[PDB]
From Swiss-Prot, chain B:
This is Triacylglycerol lipase. Changing residue 121 to A/E: No effect on enzyme activity. Monomer. Interacts with lipase-specific foldase Lif. Its main location: secreted. It catalyses: a triacylglycerol + H2O = a diacylglycerol + a fatty acid + H(+). The lineage of its organism: Bacteria, Pseudomonadati, Pseudomonadota, Betaproteobacteria, Burkholderiales. Binds 1 Ca(2+) ion per subunit. It is found in: Secreted. Residues 9-219 form the AB hydrolase-1 domain. The chain holds residues 40 to 258 of 358 of the full protein.
Length: 97, 219
């Protein structure tokens, strides 16, 4: 793809094969970058995602990685989304909700 | 099992990318997450807003989510819920927090286009010339991914395109004017807003995160 790169994947990453959304979201994310979005997840820019207390925007994830998708496949550099959501539910618990 | 994720109030997971046909199967959208949270003591409820398009309006996803929240509350005896939404689900969760602030304890958004999506905008532009949008390889690959994420349909092309209409910069602009939130920073600042908000006599904890795998390169 022109004008963008996917930092979620390492060299010869199997996620580029087994999960078609990896390369598809790099292509949609490049279209976004040509439309002044800046860094993004393939569908949503970092700027557009910001709301309330931002835990992080540095995860090396595309839009479907966020929901541990397709069928839990993620690039070699992607953080574990199941653990990230779990941590947040404990965060809510410790905040009294 | 343990109580690591045992919140005071029920957790509602709110999907965003969905089909146009009510009651589709949404059990695997949050892949492997419901069973994980349940093993850690959470009371997890997965909303199903398939078949509803926009968030606002009498028959939008917002009123449907609100009705689901009141159902979870009447059943459990709980007074509030924690809303966690992905993509459009974050906008749907904001609707419920605005129209029924007393029922919400927190709003967390994951990959939500609060200010819109430039890909949704691109597709809107392309459709003026190619109304099917399939002449574009980038659009066709997205359509195919969408189809794989949701339950089977004869009309994946149509549904995938429909999923982006609510997410344009223009649509979300109107939404933000109609449903303001202290959680949002000022327009054009690329900064977040406040960590909490007082709406009725209710305090809401506000949170978000996003992914930045796709970075701009000079070549
Ligand atoms: Ca993936």
């Amino acid at each position: 793809v022109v004008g963008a790169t996917d930092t979620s994947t390492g060299t010869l990453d199997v996620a580029n094969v087994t999960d078609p959304s990896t390369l598809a979201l790099l292509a949609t994310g490049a279209v976004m970058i040509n439309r002044a979005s800046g860094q993004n997840d393939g569908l949503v820019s970092r700027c557009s995602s910001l709301f309330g207390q931002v835990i992080s925007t540095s995860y090396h994830w595309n839009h479907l990685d966020e929901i541990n998708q397709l069928l839990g496949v993620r690039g070699a550099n992607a953080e574990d989304p199941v653990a990230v959501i779990r941590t947040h539910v404990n965060r809510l618990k410790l905040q009294g909700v | 099992a343990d109580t690591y994720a045992a919140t005071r109030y029920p957790v509602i997971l709110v999907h965003g990318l969905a089909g146009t046909d009510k009651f589709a199967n949404v059990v695997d959208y949050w892949y492997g997450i419901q069973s994980d949270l349940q093993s850690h003591g959470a009371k997890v409820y997965v909303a199903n807003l398939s078949g509803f398009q926009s968030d606002d309006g009498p028959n939008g996803r917002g009123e449907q989510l609100l009705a689901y929240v009141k159902q979870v509350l009447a059943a459990t005896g709980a007074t509030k819920v924690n809303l966690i939404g992905h993509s459009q689900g974050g906008l749907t969760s904001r609707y419920v927090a605005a129209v029924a602030p007393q029922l919400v304890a927190s709003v967390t958004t994951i990959g939500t286009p609060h200010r819109g999506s430039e890909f949704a905008d691109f597709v809107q532009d392309v459709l003026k010339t190619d109304p099917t949008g399939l002449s574009s390889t980038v659009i066709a690959a997205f359509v195919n991914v969408f189809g794989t994420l949701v339950s089977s349909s004869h009309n994946t092309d149509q549904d995938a395109l429909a999923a982006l209409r609510t997410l344009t910069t223009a649509q979300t602009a109107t939404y933000n004017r109609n449903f303001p939130s202290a959680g949002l920073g000022a327009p054009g600042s690329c900064q977040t807003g406040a960590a909490t908000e007082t709406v009725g006599g209710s305090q809401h904890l506000l949170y978000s995160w996003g992914g930045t795998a796709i970075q701009p390169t000079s070549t």
